[PDB]
């Protein structure tokens, strides 16, 4: 969806204000984030790998980082808000985090199925051959 | 990954043995599974929509179906085993359910990060600029 560089900048700016509290060089002997990650990012498991890493920093690394180093707290928190904010725009970009989005068609189907109760179950079951034809059409167009 | 028709057949066979207990025609007035589902299957949200529908049948519709109609129980259960079985092969097919797979690179990173304890957090934080460069490379190659 464009120029980031554009979006990325804030996020690099927020990391420059917190860099000095963590190393200021960086690990530098045996890396944690090795090129293996970059190959998955480049593969067919790309979105999942990115979504999973984003989630790893926001929920496991930053709060823990805020705890080891209370003087960095406000800097780390802002870094995590810019990262929360990037993920939201990446979701809006069909091409960047499709994998974090959910099917509105399935949500409606699930919502009718709940309203219909008993009849809901008989319809989902009677139409199972339509589901099978849609699977065949999906595998054929992919 | 090939000819299903090949894989799909069992699954149509299992549905033919259970069809007669649910309608034997099929809903037929206002459909539950409408073409909206087929458009998502055909779109960029394709895998998620399929994975979500598979999960919907296995966990919400079949067990409930087994309960409304105990005489169908063994037929529905077998249908659900053939569907459990199709999902497993679809996962193995990079092209069909990539979205249900997880990044081995991220699992290792998470596993070192846990072993390293405190140092784990300082390394993940010091290398955040490498993560940002990998995001830039991912957006650039997509």
| Residue ranges of domains in chain A | 1-142
Instruction: Round to whole Å and give the CA distance between B123 and A52.
Output: 18
HSE on the CB side for B113, CA within 13 Å? 24
Instruction: Round to whole Å and give the CA distance between B139 and B21.
Output: 50
Instruction: Round to whole Å and give the CA distance between B91 and A119.
Output: 32
Inter-helix orientation angle A46-56/B128-140, to 10°: 150
E-assigned strands of B47-95?
none
Closest CA relative to residue B68, chosen from A14, A116, A48? A116
Give chain A positions within 8 Å (CB) of B15: 128-129, 132
Q: For residue A57, give how far its alpha carbon lies from the nearest alpha carbon of chain B (Å).
A: 8
CA distances (Å), B94 to each of A43, B47, B97, B100, in order? Answer: 10, 11, 6, 10
HSE on the CB side for A7, CA within 13 Å? 19
Query: At CA B85, angle to CA B101 and CA B106, rounded to 5?
Result: 10
Cα end-to-end distance, chain B, whole Å? 24
Class for domain B1-142, per CATH? Answer: mainly alpha
Interface contact A65-B108, CB threshold 8 A: no
Chain A neighbours among B 4-43 (CB < 8 Å)?
4-5, 8, 11-12, 15, 18-19, 22-28, 31-34, 36-42
Interface contact B130-A26, CB threshold 8 A: yes
CA distances (Å), A52 to each of A58, A83, A108, B97, in order? Answer: 10, 13, 27, 17
**Backbone dihedral angles phi then psi of residue B141, each to the nearest 5 degrees:** -90, 40
CA distances (Å), B34 to each of A58, A138, B40, B110, in order? Answer: 38, 15, 11, 41
Which residues are CB-neighbours of B109 under 8 A, at least 6 positions away? A32, A33, A34, A37, A53, A56
HSE on the CB side for A32, CA within 13 Å? 27
């Amino acid at each position: 969806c464009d120029n980031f560089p554009q979006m990325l900048r804030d996020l690099r700016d927020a990391f420059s204000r917190v860099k000095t509290f963590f190393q200021t060089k960086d690990e530098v002997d045996n890396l944690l984030l090795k090129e293996s990650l970059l190959e998955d990012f480049k593969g067919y498991l790309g979105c999942q790998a990115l979504s999973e890493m984003i989630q790893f920093y926001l929920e496991e690394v930053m709060p823990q980082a805020e705890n080891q180093d209370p003087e960095a707290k406000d800097h780390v928190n802002s870094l995590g808000e810019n990262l929360k904010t990037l993920r939201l725009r990446l979701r809006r970009c069909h091409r960047f985090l499709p994998c974090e989005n959910k099917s509105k068609a399935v949500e409606q189907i699930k919502n009718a199925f709940n309203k219909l109760q008993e009849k809901g179950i008989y319809k989902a079951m009677s139409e199972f051959d339509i589901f099978i034809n849609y699977i065949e059409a999906y595998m054929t167009i992919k």
